[PDB]
């Protein structure tokens, strides 16, 4: 079934697609062929995996930006590039000195800035960065076995949506990142959370005077230290054992935290979690009362956090606060979009509200900044709803321009040793997505890293219809990292920069060529597909607007 290949030049019927005598470039090898009998004959480049990325040779620059063609690069900032090591251990955070599974390694906004020319060479149109908001300051026990201290190095444990986390940089650093990204054609997505707050941690309890301990008076100082967060497991204990100093029952102490009006939780005297998706608690993270219709005031512990930018606003609910707070980042910096976490676990009119206010914020920034706005496009919003597929679901009606597509990973794993197998999926996706966008990927921070087939991953991904998501280090086969007893941890390992210019430089160049080809033809991500019948191999035509491409794979070997 799967096509085999001579290893010798390759003859193609371009008779339907390209005029006669016209010049056709193979973007990969750069060879230009003139059509003779409705035919061209090209030898694919050695590093090509049998591909010919046939474009009209008149094309000479990247196509205007379209979300339906977008190449989104998703980075965990702390794990990417350390531009500033003076901010690596903010708020008393330490490294663990034992594998660093869950510590802040130090990646920050200035380093990510440094790396923008690299990213545009990779054909990246959108930069999805992990939430830069101020996280919980300390750590919880990591893995099922208390194997390591787990901090908020990934941005999902937000504590104050109005501040930057000091590990990330300051306001000047964010603005420099966003404006350098825009000057290079790269839009900025923030990763965003409204379902939950971060965990309670020893560092935060000590710093903002909330919660409660079993220890009293001098026992606190005798067992915990001057800095409670600095605790280490004793003999036979694990990193979960610090819980046994914390009294999670105590009403008075735990009411001085977020507040009964803000969250549901087993802790203290708070409304307890529910059993449906909206009101349940994931991984014992407290669920925010997004549906509450009653004015809540600030989180109670903000009384003790003098450096917050949050201000009480008459009649606002928790939802109102979150959507105002999120929107200010857009209004002040011109963020282009949000990727929304745990979207199944918050009611849909809350996301719609978030989208309403974020769009007004982006419009308002672009009007204030006509020199910095690349264009007039509205705010964009994508969402992680677990296991969503290629369907225009209810999410589309409530503010989501595109959902993350979980079904592509397995579809691409099937076609590792035969690009041709993607055809079915590629036909359906090209058809279906004439009416809506999705975001597809190979590697995820909460699934696995796609490392089969080496750099074949490139064409498995970048040829997808719809917007695609390069998980950072896909281009360089970034290894799965230390993980301990949390199976997902190794997916968040350091970018392998040494490999980028050494052992993996060929993989990166392969990715570069295929991704530039995509950036150069909106037909790839948005066109309709006709699959060709050829004498040797697999191939297809994509066509959208006035843009046609022909993509041919020779065969195995
Ligand atoms: Ca740093
Ligand atoms: Ca919820």
Residue numbers in the entry: 120 to 676
Sentences from the paper on this structure:
MalS is an α-amylase that breaks down maltodextrins in the periplasm, hydrolyzing the 1,4-glucosidic bond of amylose and long maltodextrin to release maltohexaose. According to the carbohydrate-active enzymes (CAZy) database, MalS is classified as a member of GH13_19. MalS is an integral component of the maltose utilization pathway in Escherichia coli, crucial to the effective utilization of maltodextrin.
The conventional C-domain of amylase consists of amino acids 120–180 (N-terminal) and 646–676 (C-terminal) in MalS, and the whole domain architecture shows the complete circular permutation of C-A-B-A-C in domain order. The MalS structure has clear disulfide bridges between C121 and C537, located in domains C and A. Based on high electron densities and coordination geometry, we identified two calcium ion positions in the MalS structure. In MalS, Ca1 was located around the -3, -4 subunit binding loop, and thus it stabilized the loop formed by residues 397–406 and participated in substrate binding at the active site. Similar to the catalytic action of common amylases, D460 acts as a nucleophile, E503 as a proton donor, and D565 as a transition state stabilizer.
